[PDB]
Design a binder for this molecule. Structure first.
Ligand SMILES: O=C(COP(=O)(O)O)[C@@H](O)[C@H](O)COP(=O)(O)O
Ligand SMILES: [Mg+2]
Length: 226
C-alpha cells in the first residue's frame, strides 16, 4: 500500500520561502550589489527551481549591478546565510507534517526527502524543526545538485526511489508546487499537493489530492490513495 513517503522540503515540510528570500537579499546587500527581490518578483523567479538557476535567470534580464562573482559563489554565501537564519529558530513545521512522520516511523515506513534545495538547508531545517540531524528523520536524502536537471525533471525522485528500493506504486510524494507535482508524476508517483503563499495561484492538474493542509490527510490513513 505505502512502503515509502517522499517529502518535498520548501513549502512542504515548512513555509520557508520568505526566509530564502531574506537570505538572497541579505547576501546581495553584503556583496555591495543593488539587487533586491520583493515578493512580486520572487513569486515569478520561484518557477525556476534551484538558487543558482534562479540567480542565472535574474541576471539574464536585470539592469542593476553586474555579478561580482561566479553564481556558485554568490549562492554558497546565500546558503551559509540561510543555515544561519534557520538556526535563529522562528520556522515551524506545516500542520500535519510532524505527526505524519512520527506515525510513519512507528509503522516502519521508510521516508525520503526529494528537493531542489541545497543539502545544508535540509540539515538546518531538521535541526531547527525536528531537533535531529536529517539522517535521523529521513532514510534517504535526495537534494540539490545530486542530479543534473532539477524539478520539474523527475530525476531527483528517481534518485530517491533507487536508494529506497521501493517501486513508485508503493510510494507517495507530498508537494507544494507545480514543478514539484510534475517531477513526482514524472517518476510515476501518486502525489498529494498542498500549496502555500507562493504557489496557490498555480494549476494542479493531475494531483491525486489537492489539500488546503496536510493535516487534512488524517495521518497515514489518508496516504493510501488509488
Ligand atoms: O526551488 C526551490 C524549492 O525547493 P523544494 O524543491 O524543496 O520545494 C529551491 O531552489 C529554493 O527556492 C531555494 O533553495 P536553494 O537556494 O538552496 O536552491
Ligand atoms: Mg517545494
Amino acid at each position: 500500500m505505502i512502503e515509502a513517503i517522499l517529502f518535498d522540503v520548501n513549502g512542504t515540510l515548512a513555509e520557508t520561502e520568505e526566509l530564502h528570500r531574506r537570505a538572497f537579499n541579505e547576501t546581495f546587500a553584503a556583496l555591495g550589489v543593488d539587487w533586491f527581490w520583493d515578493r512580486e518578483e520572487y513569486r515569478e523567479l520561484l518557477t525556476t527551481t534551484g538558487g543558482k538557476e534562479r540567480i542565472a535567470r535574474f541576471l539574464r534580464h536585470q539592469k542593476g549591478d553586474p555579478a561580482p562573482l561566479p553564481i556558485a559563489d554568490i549562492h554558497r554565501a546565500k546558503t551559509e546565510r540561510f543555515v544561519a537564519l534557520m538556526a535563529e529558530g522562528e520556522i515551524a513545521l506545516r500542520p500535519g507534517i510532524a505527526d505524519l512522520i512520527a506515525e510513519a516511523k512507528r509503522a516502519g515506513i521508510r521516508l525520503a526527502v526529494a528537493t531542489t534545495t541545497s543539502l545544508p538547508n535540509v540539515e538546518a531545517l531538521c535541526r531547527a524543526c525536528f531537533g535531529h540531524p536529517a539522517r535521523e528523520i529521513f532514510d534517504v536524502i535526495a537534494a540539490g545538485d545530486m542530479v543534473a536537471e532539477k524539478k520539474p525533471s523527475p530525476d531527483i525522485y528517481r534518485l530517491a526511489l533507487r536508494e529506497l528500493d521501493v517501486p513508485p506504486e508503493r510510494a507517495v510524494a507530498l508537494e507544494d508546487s507545480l514543478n514539484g507535482l510534475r517531477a513526482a508524476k514524472g517518476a510515476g508517483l501518486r502525489c498529494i499537493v498542498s500549496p502555500g503563499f507562493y504557489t496557490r495561484h498555480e494549476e494542479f492538474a493531475g494531483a491525486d489530492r489537492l489539500l488546503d493542509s496536510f493535516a487534512e490527510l488524517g495521518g497515514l490513513a489518508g496516504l493510501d490513495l488509488t
